[PDB]
Design a protein around this motif. Structure first.
Motif, PDB file in Angstrom:
ATOM      1  N   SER A  46       5.720   0.108 144.282  1.00  0.00           N
ATOM      2  CA  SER A  46       5.515   1.531 144.035  1.00  0.00           C
ATOM      3  C   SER A  46       6.139   2.369 145.147  1.00  0.00           C
ATOM      4  O   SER A  46       6.619   3.485 144.904  1.00  0.00           O
ATOM      5  CB  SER A  46       4.024   1.827 143.885  1.00  0.00           C
ATOM      6  N   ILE A  47       6.156   1.835 146.372  1.00  0.00           N
ATOM      7  CA  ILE A  47       6.825   2.509 147.483  1.00  0.00           C
ATOM      8  C   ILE A  47       8.307   2.689 147.179  1.00  0.00           C
ATOM      9  O   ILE A  47       8.872   3.772 147.379  1.00  0.00           O
ATOM     10  CB  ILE A  47       6.605   1.720 148.789  1.00  0.00           C
ATOM     11  N   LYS A  64      -2.111   9.859 132.282  1.00  0.00           N
ATOM     12  CA  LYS A  64      -3.418  10.245 132.799  1.00  0.00           C
ATOM     13  C   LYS A  64      -4.517   9.683 131.902  1.00  0.00           C
ATOM     14  O   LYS A  64      -5.405   8.943 132.352  1.00  0.00           O
ATOM     15  CB  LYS A  64      -3.482  11.775 132.831  1.00  0.00           C
ATOM     16  N   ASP A  73       4.250   3.976 139.725  1.00  0.00           N
ATOM     17  CA  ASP A  73       2.989   4.185 140.423  1.00  0.00           C
ATOM     18  C   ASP A  73       1.822   3.657 139.598  1.00  0.00           C
ATOM     19  O   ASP A  73       0.951   2.943 140.112  1.00  0.00           O
ATOM     20  CB  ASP A  73       2.817   5.671 140.730  1.00  0.00           C
ATOM     21  N   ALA A  82       2.754  -5.114 144.871  1.00  0.00           N
ATOM     22  CA  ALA A  82       2.540  -3.929 144.046  1.00  0.00           C
ATOM     23  C   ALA A  82       2.682  -2.659 144.872  1.00  0.00           C
ATOM     24  O   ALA A  82       3.346  -1.697 144.454  1.00  0.00           O
ATOM     25  CB  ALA A  82       1.163  -3.989 143.389  1.00  0.00           C
ATOM     26  N   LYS A  83       2.072  -2.644 146.061  1.00  0.00           N
ATOM     27  CA  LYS A  83       2.147  -1.460 146.910  1.00  0.00           C
ATOM     28  C   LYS A  83       3.592  -1.126 147.257  1.00  0.00           C
ATOM     29  O   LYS A  83       4.029   0.022 147.119  1.00  0.00           O
ATOM     30  CB  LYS A  83       1.331  -1.671 148.184  1.00  0.00           C
ATOM     31  N   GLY A 128       1.790   0.006 139.654  1.00  0.00           N
ATOM     32  CA  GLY A 128       1.212  -0.451 140.905  1.00  0.00           C
ATOM     33  C   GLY A 128      -0.304  -0.435 140.884  1.00  0.00           C
ATOM     34  O   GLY A 128      -0.950  -1.363 141.373  1.00  0.00           O
ATOM     35  N   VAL A 129      -0.892   0.619 140.313  1.00  0.00           N
ATOM     36  CA  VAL A 129      -2.350   0.658 140.176  1.00  0.00           C
ATOM     37  C   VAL A 129      -2.840  -0.480 139.289  1.00  0.00           C
ATOM     38  O   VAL A 129      -3.880  -1.096 139.558  1.00  0.00           O
ATOM     39  CB  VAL A 129      -2.825   2.021 139.642  1.00  0.00           C
TER      40      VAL A 129
END
Lengths: 271, 68, 271
Positions: free
Chosen positions: C87-88, C248, C102, C83-84, C105-106
């Motif tokens: 998103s990278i 958000k 992103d 996941a990290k 990924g969260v």
């Protein structure tokens, strides 16, 4: 911290960051241990090895805070020297340039002396933290004795439940327990009081320093406005400089405002 | 005899507090030493009370047994 | 199991399998022992050789469950890294694409942390299984002694029916038998209790993890709906992205729902 929910080590730009792109990272970030040397690191590690366990962290905090104060006073002295030698360079220049850089040097001198005053307040707060460290680390051995005596009582009971020392040791355990629970109560009380007072003092000093530096910066920008930035065409003469009186009054007003500033005079309004 | 060292510590700490106050009334150790003196005093007066109780009980029981 | 009465190693398609054809088998199914290595296999075989006979199977179960937990924590860490780094990769893309990847990924980060919590619960259940293994494997030697003593009594009776040791050995056999039948009764009781409690805990953790992952997946699909999948014609400009606030609120609501979830809040209704 400004990080939004993302794995990024980057924060959403603020209004100031939206106004203009942020500058590139500093070119002076060299490769080292990240701190400069090793003697202070040895001191910090010794604070993290030899001291009592429950007071070890607070002793380390005190040592690191002393390191921070040392670095702050060193950088304040270096900023003072930088202002002095900057004005020294500006001496042999245009008369307008000489006056403007001289007044800027005085303003940075004021910034340095305000930094020194804030450093004195910061050291007072550090001394308060040292005091709370001392009282709490001296109250730790009460619980140390309680734990030792309860371990001894358990071992004696296992080894010989009918030993005559059981009753006297039990009385001593009761006595250390009466010594210890209410000592925990007093420790919580004194910790709350000392922490609140020290942090209130530190934040008052912080806001005072910030407001004084902000006033200095505003006056300095208003005085920079006095500087004639209009270029002169090649081959022409130098127009006469007459900004002595205007900067005269500007620095007078800056000193008057610095004298007039009070804690209640702070115009920062948190919401 | 095991409750005696409580009062021994109380006397030692009060002597140390008096000496520190005479030598330096503004020393930072004054407050922590004063808390410790209070703590030993709370440890000691009520320990005297318990000692009196246990002494009375043990003496009465032992002498009643001996006289019987 | 879903197999209908046929020799086929294939099951009748369900409603989901009727909706669309199943995907082809995974291309990563290589040729090996089917498990990856040999050290854990040696550990499992040692559990299946050296331990007491009647506790050997349960000790093997505990070892295999430890292997499962190790693999689960390893794959959770690998999913976190995936996941990290996904998103990278999504950082240097369209702003809408960057934000969507992103947030995904969260969400996968949340899935990984929920997997870790379920792993902790699963290890608690494994510890309960270890406890039942311990008590039952320690009650086995009672029946071991009973069998040994009855064999010795039979051999002595055959060799010398009038031996003086017959009576004392018979008393000892009676005594081990009184030790053993009621020990079997207690073993059955404790086995029932421990198994029921451990499996109830495991299934509660399973349903909690499944419901949380399902909520995460639903929120993630609703957030994928925010993504603008409309292609832009060649040579045109990029439309402005304004989905910061919608995602958000979506991630805020996902966190709020995850906090709000309770065991009774589960909406799964078996029939």
């Amino acid at each position: 911290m400004h990080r939004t929910y993302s794995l990024r080590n980057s924060r959403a730009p603020t209004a100031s960051q939206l106004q203009n792109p942020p500058p590139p990272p500093s070119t002076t970030k060299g490769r080292f241990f990240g701190k400069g040397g090793l003697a202070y690191s040895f001191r910090r590690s010794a604070a993290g090895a030899f001291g009592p366990e429950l007071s070890r962290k607070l002793s380390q905090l005190v040592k690191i805070e002393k390191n921070v104060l040392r670095s702050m006073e060193l950088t304040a002295n270096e900023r003072r020297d930088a202002a002095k030698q900057l004005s020294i360079w500006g001496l042999e220049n245009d008369d307008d340039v000489s006056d403007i850089t001289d007044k800027l040097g005085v303003l940075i001198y004021e910034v340095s002396e305000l930094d020194d005053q804030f450093i004195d307040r910061y050291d007072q707060y550090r001394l308060t933290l040292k005091s709370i460290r001392d009282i709490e680390g001296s109250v730790q051995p009460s619980r140390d004795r309680k734990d030792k005596i309860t371990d001894k009582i358990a071992y004696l009971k296992y080894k010989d439940p009918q030993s005559p020392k059981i009753e006297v040791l039990e009385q001593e355990l009761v006595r250390a327990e009466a010594e210890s629970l209410v000592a925990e109560a007093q420790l919580s009380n004194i910790t709350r009081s000392k922490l609140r007072a020290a942090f209130n003092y530190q934040f008052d000093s912080i806001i005072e320093h910030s407001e004084k530096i902000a006033l200095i910066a505003g006056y300095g920008k208003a005085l920079l406005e006095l500087l004639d930035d209009s270029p002169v065409t090649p081959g022409e003469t130098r127009p006469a400089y007459d900004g002595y009186e205007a900067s005269k009054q500007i620095i007078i007003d800056a000193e008057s405002a610095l004298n007039e500033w009070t804690l209640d005079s702070a115009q920062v309004k948190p919401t």
